[PDB]
Amino acid sequence: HAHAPKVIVFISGSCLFGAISRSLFKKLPIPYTVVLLILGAILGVVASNVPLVEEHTRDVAHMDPHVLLQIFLPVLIFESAFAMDVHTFMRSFSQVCILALFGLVVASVLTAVLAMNLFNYNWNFSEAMMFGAIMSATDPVAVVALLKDLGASKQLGTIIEGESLLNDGCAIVIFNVFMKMVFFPQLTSTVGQNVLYFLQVAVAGPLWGYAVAKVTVFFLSHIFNDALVEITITLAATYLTYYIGDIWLEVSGVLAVVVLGLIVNAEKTSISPEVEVFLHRFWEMLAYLANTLIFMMVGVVVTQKALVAVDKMDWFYLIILYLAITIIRGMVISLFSPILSRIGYGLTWRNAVIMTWGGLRGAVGLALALVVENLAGNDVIGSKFLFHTAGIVVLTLVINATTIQTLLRILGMSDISIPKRLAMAGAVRRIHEGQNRTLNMLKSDRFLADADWDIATAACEISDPYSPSPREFADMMEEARLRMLKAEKISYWKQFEHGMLAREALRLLVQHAEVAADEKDQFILVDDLKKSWQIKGIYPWLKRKLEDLISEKKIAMYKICHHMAFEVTINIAIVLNIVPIIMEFVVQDLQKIEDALRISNYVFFVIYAIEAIVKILGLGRHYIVSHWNKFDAFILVVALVDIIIIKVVKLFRLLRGLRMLRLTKALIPKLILVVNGKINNQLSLGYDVGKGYIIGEEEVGKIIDRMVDNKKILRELKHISETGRLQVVKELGLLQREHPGIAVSVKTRQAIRTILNHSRETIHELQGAGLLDEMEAHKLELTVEIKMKRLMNAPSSIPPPPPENLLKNVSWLAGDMKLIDFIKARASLLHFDYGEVIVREGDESDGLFLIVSGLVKLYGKVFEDYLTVGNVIGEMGVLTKKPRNATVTCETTVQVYFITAEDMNIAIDTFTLYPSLEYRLWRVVAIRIATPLIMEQMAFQGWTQEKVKLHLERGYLVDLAESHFQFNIDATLEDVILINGTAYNAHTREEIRSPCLISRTVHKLTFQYTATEEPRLFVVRNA
Amino acid sequence: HAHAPKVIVFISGSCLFGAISRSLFKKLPIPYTVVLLILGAILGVVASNVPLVEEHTRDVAHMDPHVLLQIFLPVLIFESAFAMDVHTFMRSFSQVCILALFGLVVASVLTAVLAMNLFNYNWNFSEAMMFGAIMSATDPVAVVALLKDLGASKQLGTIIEGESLLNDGCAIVIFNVFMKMVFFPQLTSTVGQNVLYFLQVAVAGPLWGYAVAKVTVFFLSHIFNDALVEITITLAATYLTYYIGDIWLEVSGVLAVVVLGLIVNAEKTSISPEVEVFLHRFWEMLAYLANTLIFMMVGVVVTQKALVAVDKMDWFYLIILYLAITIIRGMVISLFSPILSRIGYGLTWRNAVIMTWGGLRGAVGLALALVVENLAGNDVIGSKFLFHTAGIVVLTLVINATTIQTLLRILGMSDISIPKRLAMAGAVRRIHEGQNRTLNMLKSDRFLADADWDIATAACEISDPYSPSPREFADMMEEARLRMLKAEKISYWKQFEHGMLAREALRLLVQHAEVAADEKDQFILVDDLKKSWQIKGIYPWLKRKLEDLISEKKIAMYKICHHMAFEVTINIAIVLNIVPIIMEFVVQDLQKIEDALRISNYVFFVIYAIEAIVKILGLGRHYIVSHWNKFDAFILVVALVDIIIIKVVKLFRLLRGLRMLRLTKALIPKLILVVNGKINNQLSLGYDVGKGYIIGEEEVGKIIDRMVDNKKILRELKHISETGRLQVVKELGLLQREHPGIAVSVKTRQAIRTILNHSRETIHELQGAGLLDEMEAHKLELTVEIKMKRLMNAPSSIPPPPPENLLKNVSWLAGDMKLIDFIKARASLLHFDYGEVIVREGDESDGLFLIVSGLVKLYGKVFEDYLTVGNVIGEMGVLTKKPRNATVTCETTVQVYFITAEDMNIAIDTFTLYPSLEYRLWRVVAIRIATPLIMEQMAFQGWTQEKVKLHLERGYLVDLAESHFQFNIDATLEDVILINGTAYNAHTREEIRSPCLISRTVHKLTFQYTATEEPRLFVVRNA
């Protein structure tokens, strides 16, 4: 049949040709795109003779320009943006913006001048600027792929990629401008019109993209368990944004799509992870299809109607143009180098050379050249444009793309560093050992004894891809420093893999560690981490001001005046009435429409009059005290004036202003929520990085004790770590005090994340045991994922709980309502000011302190520490009745719940059960004492501190009421720690001190009925 | 600009409307498709008045029929096929084929008769058959989703889905036929032409799809580390198959796409797993887009130009038609029920009612109705077709789709079974316990003490979604039987999750277990498992015959006559020459072409003459003995006759036949490989299921010893398990003997799979420790995945290794070339026939037997067992010098390497090192003895037998040369087992027997220097 969609044949053929090209030239240096161009040229030449191939090709090869752009360019641009590492892009944004915007301007201008002066085509400035804009387009994929693969200068890869993104967007903008100037020349517009056009293309585009992106992520964050909807929304958002911006609004669509991609890639937390991984490959595949189609269309067109108008001088011009554009890009990079060196990551001459050589052209330039070809028609301009663009693309893909690897080798950037080589060698050796063990296991299997082991061993073998004095003191200290940095990086990776750290915090910590590792005796100084948790003053200032604006404490039928429905109704009334207020006056700027709209205006005036009467008769004389109500009264005044009544054009403005401005009262709270959200993001990263650093320091300080030899260097390293940890904890406490609600929200979020992660772990564990079918386990996992996604929509400003809630949430006051009542009755609330001492070292343990507000410093004896809300001081005091262990000083205004030692003795005596109160207290103290010991003995193994704390949580405290000697049964036992008192090994009668871990070899423990030091011992069990 | 692609707006709008519909009506019973139809109707009515909306809609709403089909129908059909559970579909294929093909025929015929007689439209039979074909289309999604969710009658879900797939395909075929009969009426064709047309649509379609699918999977199985290529190949294959089949070949494209989807979904092992999971969602999303677009187009068209021609009687006809089609489907199901009950899964009346009520119509029927609308144009036929189709779709989506849940409730199918409720309750309780533990852990954290715990606890809470006598003896035996079945299912799931079982074997075992669990005292009888490993005689017969054909033992310049290049060259010559032999004669059926082709024919005759002279002068008088060479000589005879010369038309056939038939010699070996592949698949499933059953029986036989009480029922269960295991092992050994090479290939494949799985596990383990960066670990994982995918392309017929290789691959002869030489010198090869006894019980241990071929039965004293190739007999004999433990009887012709006890004593004495030969022997024996003990004590925990064997592999044998008493240090120790001799606990002097596991409580062991029973003890260590 004649009306078959022949485009399908061409599309699928391009797919298969791309498959063949990639498969065959996977290992060769020449990229597959050149093969696609050659195949397209062959296809075009054969079509020129065979009419059937012409029938199958014409539909796509001679496609309309607008179709080409509005289908392919959004795909290419959004795939480029959605592939970005947005965070390093933003941290190098100024550098990339300079290098991209100003670099494109200069390069395109110089290329246009070259085209006008060198070429004999006698082009005008508009056509030459079009040419330069096309030539300035860039394609980083083949170079950034290598830079990401080699791992050298990870910053350079993203600088190149983002520069390509931005220069491609701006090049498309410039191309559209000059294309409209040359092929659709309108009348010479006024300078004001040109300024408006500039604002419309350069400013309105990003704002349109930003609005669409924020709306898109808003909806995405409220879709649960519907992947198809999320993917469909993303796709439709991209295409609809481009179409609406470029056509309806005449706004720059490419920039809008760039902003949309960046914003969604940043807010990517709003997207379910599985559809995120789906979307990455989906957009990669769409971009691949677009690239293949564009290259094959270029081949067809260039062989059909471009080379026919090519002369000998054109080749010389092509060579000169290639050299010229290379030199121009190099000159631009070197010229801005003085500026870029002082901004962001800076530039080395090696990085600059890679940037200069790696500037490949690609699909964007070819698409624009095809547009020029279609628009020019019979004119030679299109032929020359397509010829030169394709020639330079071919040259870059043949010379630059193939020689970039050799250049990276020559400049010394491709060298794998020694640490990576050592890590790979160790991993390969461990893999070989595991494979040998598995082979030995299999050879013993009766059902596999006859298997050909030579073939198996050959098949499963994995190979290494990379295959007392000052000098001595300096060597030893460098060794210790590098080893500590490696241990810290390992700790951060372990923290992340178990879900305790977000990716951003891990990346910050790791990159800081690496930077410190290549700068003399530079450890990870806290000052660099400081910038993570430093809140810019703009957000706190805005919060303070805006919250002042909505402070109704001057004010706080009457029942309705303070009921929600009233405000909701009037808000809806204003928002609805705004639509007529726009439509009517724009229509005036048909009488049966105006009169009806003015009747509706009477109706809305009646609604406002009813509302004003409501407020007056409810709030009495207090109504007009509020400035908001003053504005409302002025609204009613204007309404009376203009309903009783230059008057017309006066009314058209007054009834717009007085009515549109009334919704700012409802707007401001949402703006406060936005400010809270940004502060929450910054504070969340601050907490993540600070806590990660503290935990890593704690783990490494006990790792190094067994892996660094000299005592003095060990002490120096410990001192450095302790100083950093103390500073970090103090800063985090002060931040908590500055913004209570945000800190509470962050901590609740972290708690929920941890609980849900461990719940998913339990689900997986009991699925592996086969106790749940895959489908039911999947259902439970779906519930977990839905809860986790709803977590992202937390209020972000949870009000701080009152002291009573903190008292009733203490670990050893969980449940047990009667004990909570007793303690709340006995407790007293004490307030202290800055610099005061709550309690001193050596004092008698007169009671507990539960910090309900503030921050305290704990000095002792080198024992400096900081405590904040929730922490309770003096448990050891009341339990063992020994003197105070530390001096408590307030670093800020502090409020503490004080419970006397006598009230604690009374509570302990009065409350007794299997979950004994004293049992709970000693359990908490014993876990806190035990965790450091278990890490000190076993931090060299893969256990994190979280694993140790959960391991102890599974344990129990030995009673010694049913016995007076403890047997290491090793069934229902995994490890033992002593806390209080002294014990003796039954057989050898060796002595164990109070805080000592029980050695593995020890068999049985003997105790004494010494009430003064009634021994307490902790045990953990396997099953 | 005017030439903007307005289709983009409509597509993206349909996307957003679908998103809104799904989001809003997620919980309501009404499906979102009805909402989409209503929205499309609103859009059409508003378009009829607003011309701009008409401009934006016309491009899609009034789309060409061919575009509609060739874009959407392939997507819908391939998504339906690629979503299939192909294996249960194939195991119910006959039932589905009856119910679908004959059911569609009857239903469509009856619907057409109803249309002709009831409706006043005065339709002819062609139009009525079109109507019936449209009405017969089905959409199971909303019902199969529930059946898969509830888990009741999993077979019913796939029966419905496959019936829908096949009936939709056949309905499209019938619609195409009658559409061509009515709207493109050609001249009345002859009956032979009709038969050819039937073969072309019904037969050639499936074959075209099969060929394309096999080629596609062939290419997919040779693409490594390129996801984009795989996805692009799949997409292009689907569309190109449909286009080529329907247009170029005029072959049924829908059936071709159905076969393509099924074959790819079956050969899905050829696809990289990540792109498999990508592709499932990709095709689901494409189908979703197609559905949304079709529904919105229906709304627009029906509101614009269909309802305008609707009358009151049409609604009555619609109601009558709905009732009629429902009754017809029910009648068809009940009428075929006698046949379907005796085929496959059968049918209950409840399942039949669900099938009758769940037959929803959908996108396919609407698309065909739109085709009829576009083709009919101004005729009322299109209006009536679209009206009735849309009305019935709406009615089914409103009545059937909403009431199917209530019907499943009424029929008692929605009830969750008690075991699932218990499993869910236990999982929820464990999750609550884990969350409470995590909460206790967090509350102790100093940095989270101030978090609002009420909010967290409320957020993280997961809730249960489902919220001595004959009578007593029968209850107890049922309890034990059900408990054993549950344990077996758990064992199968554990085996699968650790990668020891393929999914198919697990599903077979689990479904067999469930079937046995609901049928009186029916355990898992081996007879059901037998059909898994039973090879159909067709493949062995074909292998034997074809391998006989290529037996060149009559035959096996001369150097070239037996060199590969010769045969390769002549094969290429024939395949190349066939192309001219086709082109020239078809062109005859321009003279400058024929003469050149005949010169080329002379050239190829010269090549054949050179080849024949080659064979003659090389092979001498032996040349003509081979029948293949007789045919070759006859080829040369015909070539001479027709080159020297009715003659023309004689030549046109003779030079085709004699030349095309010569390539069968090269074809046959590949066909033998195909036969080997199918036998390999069947044998691989047989081994998987048999070994899984054996392992599950071994684990459950030791689980039950601690969880079933009465001794007699325990003995009965043990006897049943032992009988099943013995039969399974015997059958597997016999299968191995029948097909040696295939068994060797399967076992090598399993070994490589296990090794690579454990290597990936090690990579993940050391990544979690942070010892490798994510990128390098990803590189190693990529290498592992590439090796695993290449594993799928194994030869499948690895030749059996010779006895020397088996001797040099024994576990304790690994490496150590000198010992291998000694043993190969000392060893002797003995041959035994059926029924002979190699050695008897109580005999003196005179030497080892290594089975190099055959199968042996080991009787002893109730000790019946079977051993096969690779297994070695008599190790205990030579080590402990005790009498023979069992009687060895040959169940088939057996060959054994015999090494005398004296040679073993000499080898032991002569060879001594840290990896001592006696140490190796005792290590093997100790592991074999120890594994049962560790399972017997700890099979109740989550450990599988593989975990136990690896756990022992990490261990070592205690020397007792540096000491005579063993200390349970519990560091560098995890468990202890005794093997030989007797030991005593140092403190209590309690006695430990030779095979006993050392108790956890025991402290230290004391031994004796009794050489007669020199004690051997095994130890495993943690770190």
Author numbering:
A (entry chain B), B (entry chain A): 71 to 537, 570 to 658, 671 to 703, 725 to 780, 796 to 1011, 1031 to 1192
Provide the publication's sentences verbatim.
In contrast, all membrane-embedded domains were better resolved when reconstituted into nanodiscs, yielding a map at 3.2 Å that was used for subsequent model building. SpSLC9C1 adopts an inward-facing conformation, similar to the majority of eukaryotic NHE structures, with the residues of the binding site accessible from the cytoplasm forming a negatively charged cavity. The voltage-sensing helix S4 is in the inactive upward position, as no activating hyperpolarizing conditions can be established in detergent or nanodiscs. All positively charged residues reside within the membrane and R1 (R803), which is homologous to R368 in Shaker Kv and is supposed to cross the entire membrane electric field upon activation, is still high above the gating charge transfer centre (GCTC). Prominent examples are the clear densities corresponding to two lipids embedded in the cavity found at the extracellular half of the dimer interface of the TD. Further, they form a cytoplasmic dimer interface and interprotomer interactions, with helices CH1 and CH2 of one protomer wedged between the helix pair CH8’–CH9’ and the CNBD of the adjacent protomer. Further, we could identify a network of salt bridges between CH4 and the core domain of the TD (E606–H157, R609–D155, K224–E616), which might contribute to locking the transporter in the inward conformation. Another interesting position is K939 on CH9, which is coordinated by E300, and backbone carbonyl groups located in the dimer domain. Under non-activating conditions, the TD is locked in an inward-facing state through interactions with coupling helices (state 1).
One example is the sperm-specific SLC9C1 that belongs to the SLC9 superfamily of cation/proton antiporters, known as Na+/H+ exchangers (NHEs), which are essential for the regulation of intracellular pH, sodium homeostasis and cell volume. The transport domain (TD) is accompanied by a voltage-sensing domain (VSD) and a cyclic-nucleotide binding domain (CNBD), which are regulatory units usually found in voltage-gated cyclic-nucleotide-modulated ion channels, also referred to as CNBD ion channels. In a recent patch-clamp fluorimetry study, the functional integrity of the domains was confirmed for SLC9C1 from the sea urchin Strongylocentrotus purpuratus, termed SpSLC9C1, identifying it as a Na+/H+ exchanger that is activated strictly by hyperpolarization and modulated by cyclic nucleotides (cNMPs). Specifically, SpSLC9C1 adapted to mediate cellular alkalization in sperm only in response to chemoattractant-induced hyperpolarization.
